[PDB]
Amino acid sequence: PSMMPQWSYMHISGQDASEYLSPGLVQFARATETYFSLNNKFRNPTVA
């Protein structure tokens, strides 16, 4: 629906890692994709 805390806390449904991460870590991971892959760690939700 619009409120189910467990999902939003576990990233089952909610914002994506490009957004809920503090926008300094996003910058860092975006900078070093070539040699130190970081985007594989966190998770992004997909909702039908």
Binding site: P1, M3, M4, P5, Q6, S8, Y9
Partner: protein, 88 residues
Amino acid sequence: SLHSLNSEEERILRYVQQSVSLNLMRDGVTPSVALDMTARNMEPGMYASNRPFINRLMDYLHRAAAVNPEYFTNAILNPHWLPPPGFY
């Protein structure tokens, strides 16, 4: 911090947190209905004895859930939480 709660009120607060979290997490109900369901299931003697504090806490949580969902979810899910000054 000039107003701080009495152990009985802390027990009530922890019970409210537990019940609201349980209803909201296993039954998927809306936060307003979750707050309503919690209230009823209370021991009538204690509910009547602490009617003002419980009423104020319920209204505060209601308007918090209506306005700021992130703050409401944080304050309903994190122990060691206390009502901020100005809630009095």
